[model samples]
Target: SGFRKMAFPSGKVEGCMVQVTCGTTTLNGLWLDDVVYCPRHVICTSEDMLNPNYEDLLIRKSNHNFLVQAGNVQLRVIGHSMQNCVLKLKVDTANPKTPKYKFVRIQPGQTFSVLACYNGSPSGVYQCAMRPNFTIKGSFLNGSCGSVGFNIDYDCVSFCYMHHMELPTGVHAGTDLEGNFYGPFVDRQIAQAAGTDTTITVNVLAWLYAAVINGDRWFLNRFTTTLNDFNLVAMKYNYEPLTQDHVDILGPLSAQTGIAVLDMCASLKELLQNGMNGRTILGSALLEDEFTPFDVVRQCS
Candidate 1:
């Protein structure tokens, strides 16, 4: 139990709210900490701390207006302030039993803020402080002076981990490894479960591994599924290109694998859209077995 100790089955917890007053009008709104309730406003929810989502609300000026009264000033807060949110946890592949934090972006916020806890502790008295990530200097505006409104972005600082099943959803790969050649298939499953279509791009090595795992022809057939489109590129690995010398060797070997799969894809040279770049993969496809020889010969053979 650490920063995310509060998250549990009930799917309910305390939220933070900041109070602001303008003239005779006073308004109170909620902020979130790492997608839960804001920490600063949680002052009133001491009992709620027995449970929680996170413990800090980072705030930043939003293009949305900040209005306390009528047409004078209208604040349109985004980020953590906008409701209907959840905290997504990613489990390390090597340690599926443990859950960790990753990304946050249910919707695009006009501007993003920084989330932090004041006392530098989750349960600290001043639980959260939503602050602007960038400097803001006063400026003149027409009509109503364009009141500056802030959006709450959340963050939590504490050593925390949770059970993988407790997470709202599991994480999928973005094509990180030749070892992760299995990643595209995982993503394909996730996309299908959601009943959505996905576009996946994997580098040459991983793609070849996948092709070898499935029969080269079968793997190619699986691409452009009813739910997803899987594509392979032989030019790179882990988002970077192979050295020309290495390309000279693996390039032709990998192209043989591509031929076995028998799908028309842009050759490394063609993608460059220029004639004969010396750095391009020299040859072409059908199939390899270095990753798991048994999987290659047995599964796809």
Candidate 2:
């Protein structure tokens, strides 16, 4: 037997190296830089791998871990029990120095604005989950306002033009049997007629006719022809009365009473003058190029 230290220095071994002594054997083996034992338990902790939430982990209460980029994040909760729920979300955890952790408490039908941070990095990780002990099974979807839970609406855009118009207390918008939207005053009189004062009726009629001229042309020609026959009959019906308030609401009285009013040139006059004035209310087609679809032009917000 020869005395020898088996040169197992830094060698990659898979099994136990049992010592055996023989007559002398000079083994010329290449030197290994590192030695790796057959690991009983593999442990990996690195940024390259995702930290998953296993059911066994008590701290990881959420079943889903949403890892998004540094932009607008639309986060919503699922399940009926989760309404008015409070949850914690971790932001930019990749950077340990400036990591953000927040507890968002919200109720149903409420708005929440979360100014999430990227913190000089491109990471937005919001870890939210229900209680691990909760037995109610649920799922996570990618939409909002369609279910029982909270809805989050977000986008990384510059401009958001939203117009909110409040009507009177009793006024309500309705839909017809044909599924057409109609306002409360559409096709209806706003006020009753007085003996000599028809200001309200005339103003409403003018407004309705203007709206119809701009919107519904299907009834325009038929109604105008019928009104022409009525005009012919009314001229011979003993008396055709006119009111100053009606003239004021409609247009100039000269244009209203004169037979020269029934001319193609008057149509051109309305097409130019009234349409130009309507641009102030509806919107200007010339300035349409200045705004995108996201922009809105209205009297007020």
Q: Write the per-residue lDDT of candidate 2 for residues 109-168, one digit (tens) a residue.
A: 112121111111211212111111111112212111011111132311111100011122
| Model 1's TM-score against the true structure | 0.18
What local distance difference test score does each model get?
A: 0.23, 0.20
- Clash totals for all models, in order? 28, 0
Model 2, which residues run further than 4 Å from truth?
Answer: 1-200, 222-245, 252-301
| Model 1 agreement with the true structure over 68-175: per-residue lDDT tens digits | 211233323333342212111111112221223233221111111212111111121111111111111112111111111222223432211110110013321111
For all the candidates, what are their Cα RMSDs to the real structure?
A: 20.8, 30.0
Candidate 1's C-alpha lDDT?
0.23
Off by over 4 Å in 1: 1-199, 203-253, 256-301
TM-score of 2: 0.15
User: Residue 293 lDDT in model 1?
Assistant: 19
Best by TM-score: 1
Worst 10 residues of 2 by lDDT: 35-44
| C-alpha-based local distance difference test score of model 2 | 0.20
